[PDB]
Design a protein around this nucleic acid. Structure first.
Ligand SMILES: [Mg+2]
Ligand SMILES: [Mg+2]
Ligand SMILES: [Mg+2]
Ligand SMILES: [Mg+2]
Ligand SMILES: [Mg+2]
Ligand SMILES: [Mg+2]
Ligand SMILES: [Mg+2]
Ligand SMILES: [Mg+2]
Ligand SMILES: [Mg+2]
Length: 231
RNA sequence: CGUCGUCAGCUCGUGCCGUGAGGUGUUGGGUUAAGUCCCGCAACGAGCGCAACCCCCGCCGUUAGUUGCCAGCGGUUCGG
């Protein structure tokens, strides 16, 4: 799968502001930052991709979570390529532990989708119209990827567990396995299937997520070639 | 029924934090007469209040013209 292409796009990130528990995946400090051991990256990648393939074979769903400014686009296209749920803008506290209450809002979202169509009604007062259109804009902004979730997922794919500790907490509490891309400032104990790679550069996230979703696509009988690559 | 006080408030469901009383939401920034609205946020929503729905005044239109009124017309003891 990977075959040494990792070095061209990334090796690691982050200086002395590190988590010492990450030391099992670090090789050296050269410019002041930590260089991730790429052989350990490959060894972990084999296990992670094997688990991902086994899960995708059985029909389970993976929730792709990423909200940094370097992943608002990669995550969306990668998760949409598999027809898979994603969170892209902001993790709403309780998106998993309060799944029923939060998913009550997508019912309102879909109800407002069938409200603004031309056939039925346009006789609402204009101020109420603007209220409902504000509500629709917010619901679409925050629940556009969450809509594909009909139940609690079988795994969550997180691009930065330190930044997204609330999602990891919710997943670990509910016994849902968590897969994470993590740099040297991360806690690996909370991550079941780790990939020790750089998660702040665009190309590293692109490569990892794109190839992961290629494996998912393969695990359902098909080969879709092109992915959105953005230099 | 008076009063704080027509003051801008008081709470709830589920989730989360805390051994617990409890907290969060409801804090921060801008705005409003207003917990009014916007942005941000472990919260996501909701209820009672605010506002609106009702009445009077201010402009115009349709239906009508008596016991109302009298622009134009003709009478007139001079009051339609
Ligand atoms: Mg918890
Ligand atoms: Mg008071
Ligand atoms: Mg509560
Ligand atoms: Mg406790
Ligand atoms: Mg209060
Ligand atoms: Mg409070
Ligand atoms: Mg008031
Ligand atoms: Mg209010
Ligand atoms: Mg009122």
């Amino acid at each position: 799968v990977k075959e040494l292409l990792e070095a061209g796009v990334h090796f690691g990130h982050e200086r002395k502001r590190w988590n010492p528990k990450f030391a099992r995946y670090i090789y050296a400090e050269r410019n002041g930052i930590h260089i991730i051991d790429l052989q350990k990256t490959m060894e972990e990648l084999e296990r992670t991709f094997r688990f991902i393939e086994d899960l995708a074979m059985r029909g389970g769903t993976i929730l792709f979570v990423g909200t940094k400014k370097q992943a608002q686009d990669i995550v969306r296209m990668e998760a949409e390529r598999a027809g898979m749920p994603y969170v892209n803008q902001r993790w709403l506290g309780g998106m998993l532990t309060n799944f029923k209450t939060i998913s009550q809002r997508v019912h309102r979202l879909e109800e407002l989708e069938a409200l603004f169509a031309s056939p039925e009604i346009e006789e609402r007062p204009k101020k109420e119209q603007v209220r409902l259109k504000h509500e629709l804009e917010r619901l679409q902004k925050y629940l556009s990827g969450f809509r594909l979730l009909k139940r609690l997922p079988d795994a969550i794919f997180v691009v930065d567990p330190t930044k997204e500790a609330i999602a990891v907490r919710e997943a670990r509490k509910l016994f849902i396995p968590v897969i994470a891309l993590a740099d040297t400032d991360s806690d690996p104990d909370l991550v079941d299937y780790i990939i020790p790679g750089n998660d702040d550069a665009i190309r590293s996230i692109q490569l990892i997520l794109s190839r992961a979703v290629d494996l998912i696509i393969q695990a359902r009988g098909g080969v879709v070639e092109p992915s959105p690559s953005y230099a």
